[PDB]
Design a protein around this ligand. Structure first.
Ligand code: BOG
Ligand code: BOG
Ligand code: C11
Length: 220
């Protein structure tokens, strides 16, 4: 799929599929946003740092800055597992566009790396956790690739749901502190572009992901 995506990305610049792709993604986002408001799901998080802080990059066409499919469930399970310890959630403000997914979301990785540095500088005592879903997992991988190992050593944990780069470790970071959740039959995890039902069910792994994070957010 890398050369397929490289070619498809060039086609997104031929004034055709460009607008067609964007509108379809915008419609999907609005539909997801309508479902969020109906069930009281918060699709936007911009909390100040807590005892634990999660910086989460949502999936393609996910509404707000955390989406509806994965992020909210993970934050709820994490806060439950943390008990009285406060969780601050910050969504990664990026377009989450099909075009950026096809091109590798390089620019978004640069921005997220700077956001990580900014959070570490502002809240040096917080236990910082990175999270991503689908394109957001790509953004997290790119962010890690843009940071030095000394900065990445300040990250307590990384949780990637439906990682398009499944098989590749998070750069400049201890893999023991990473949890990659990739379902069997998820074509996105196979480096593909096909969205299938196993890619949409990561909310079911929210408790497992929270359980992984808790021992990593210390201590002591
Ligand atoms: C239960 C079976 C229906 C699952 C429908 C999932 C909706 C996502 O739809 C998918 O979007 C992809 C976007 O890259 C396209 O490439 C796929 O062709 C399309 O099936
Ligand atoms: C079409 C969109 C797919 C929605 C299905 C999401 C899967 C629901 O998964 C649910 O997640 C919860 C964790 O947050 C768990 O408490 C439930 O046991 C689990 O079944
Ligand atoms: P990722 O960035 C996740 C994309 C999820 C799309 C959601 C489809 C809408 C279904 C709503 C269910 C009610 O995927 C990478 C490929 C992007 C092209």
């Amino acid at each position: 799929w890398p050369s397929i995506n490289e070619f498809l990305s060039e086609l997104a610049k031929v004034m055709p599929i460009g607008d067609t792709i964007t509108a379809a993604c915008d419609l999907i986002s609005d539909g997801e946003d309508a479902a969020a408001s109906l069930f009281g799901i918060s699709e936007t998080e911009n909390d100040p740092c807590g005892d634990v802080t999660v910086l989460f990059a949502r999936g393609t066409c996910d509404p707000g800055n955390v989406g509806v499919l994965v992020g909210p469930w993970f934050f709820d399970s994490l806060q439950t597992a943390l008990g009285s310890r406060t969780l601050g959630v910050k969504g990664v403000p990026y377009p989450a566009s099909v075009q950026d997914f096809l091109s590798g979301s390089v620019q978004n990785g640069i921005n997220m790396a700077n956001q990580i540095k900014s959070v570490l500088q502002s809240c040096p005592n917080t236990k910082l956790v990175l999270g991503g879903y689908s394109q957001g997992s790509m953004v997290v991988h790119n962010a890690a690739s843009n940071l030095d190992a000394a900065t990445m050593s300040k990250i307590s944990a990384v949780v990637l749901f439906g990682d398009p780069y499944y098989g590749k470790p998070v750069a400049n970071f201890d893999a023991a502190k990473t949890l990659v959740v990739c379902h069997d039959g998820d074509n996105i995890c196979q480096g593909g572009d096909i969205i299938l039902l196993p890619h949409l069910t990561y909310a079911e792994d929210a408790d497992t992901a929270a359980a992984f994070v808790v021992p990593l957010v210390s201590h002591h």
